[PDB]
C-alpha cells in the first residue's frame, strides 16, 4: 500500500541535490545540524547500484518523499537506510520503505546458503521516537549501541605516552602488508576479510601511509596494535584501532590514539572521528573520552530475523 500520489522509483544521480536536502530535514529533527550535502550523496553513492540497491519516494510536488540505500553482506545481512521526510510522517511511508528492504532482501534470498539465517538491520538515532516504535511495530529488535565519537583539534593534542617497550610505527607499503593484516585480523576477528580482500579494500588509503599507525613492541619487531586512519574530504575517518590479545591494558589503544591526532593536527585537519560498538547501555570505552574525544551521536542497532538458521555474518 502506498498513496496515490506518490512514485515511487530508482535514484538518478540528478536526484542527488533533493535527496541530500531529505536527509538534512531528517537529521535536523532529530537534533543534529544539516551537514548533509548532495557532494556526499554522490560519494556514498560510488559504491551501490543506483537501479537495484536504493529507491527514492517522489512526493506529488516533485520532491524527495522518502528514500532508502542498502548494504548487503553474502545475502545473509542487509543494512538497510531509510529517511522519511518530517512532514510526512504518519502517512505510512516508513512502513513502505521497511518492507522494501524485507522485500530486497527476501527476492535475492536464494544465493544465500539455505542454512544460513537472515536478517535485516537498520542503525536508528537513539533520540528519534518515532523510528524507534516503527522497529518495534515492524519486529525489528535493540541489539547493540553504535557510538560515533569525535573530535575538533584546534589546538596540538597531548604527546602520546607510550608502555614501557612499545613505540609508533608508521605503515611502509610494501614491506608492511601482510604483518598488519594479521594483526587487524587477530586484534579484531565484523566479517573476517581475507587477505587480498583486505588489500583490495585499503588500496586506497595505503597511497597515504602517514595515518597508519603501528604499536610495535621493540625487541621482537612485532605489531602489537594498529590505527588505521584515513582522510576523505578533509574529515579524518579512524576505522580501527586495537591491541592484539596479550598486549592489553597497557594503555596501548590511547597512544595509537593520541598519536594518530597529532598526524592529523600537524597535517591540518580539524575533525577526526570513529564509531564504537558498545553492548545496550553500558556506553563507550572510557578509552575514547581519554583520548579528547567526545560523543557525536548514538545509534541502536535494530535487527529482525527474515530466514531462520545458522548465523553465518561473522564466518
Known sequence: TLPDRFIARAP???????????????????????????????????????????????????????????????YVQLSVYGYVHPRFRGMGLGTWLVQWGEEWIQDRMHLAPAEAQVTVQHYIRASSTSALRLMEQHGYRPVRDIWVMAITLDQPPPAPEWPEGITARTFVPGLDERATYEAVEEAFGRPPSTFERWLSMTQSERKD??????????????????????????????GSVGVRRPWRGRGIALALLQEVFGVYYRRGVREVELSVDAESRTGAPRLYRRAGMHVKHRYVLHRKEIRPGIDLSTT
Not at 540528478?14 to 536527509?23: C, H, Q, S, W, Y
Not at 554522490?42 to 506529488?60: C, F, I, N, S
Not at 586512519?229 to 579524518?236: D, M, N, R, S
Request: glycine share 10%; with cysteine; aromatic share 4%.
Open 209 to 238: 601511509p602517514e595515518l597508519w599507525l603501528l604499536a610495535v613492541e621493540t625487541d621482537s619487531g612485532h605489531i602489537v596494535g594498529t590505527c588505521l586512519g584515513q582522510e576523505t574530504a578533509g574529515k579524518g575517518w579512524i
Open 12 to 74: 538518478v544521480p540528478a536526484d542527488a541535490p533533493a535527496i541530500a536536502r531529505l536527509i538534512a530535514a531528517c537529521q535536523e529533527a532529530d537534533g543534529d545540524e544539516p551537514d548533509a550535502s548532495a557532494e556526499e550523496v554522490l560519494r556514498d553513492w560510488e559504491g551501490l547500484d543506483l537501479g537495484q540497491e536504493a529507491v527514492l519516494v517522489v512526493a506529488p510536488d516533485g520532491e524527495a518523499a522518502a528514500y532508502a540505500d542498502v548494504l548487503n553482506r553474502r
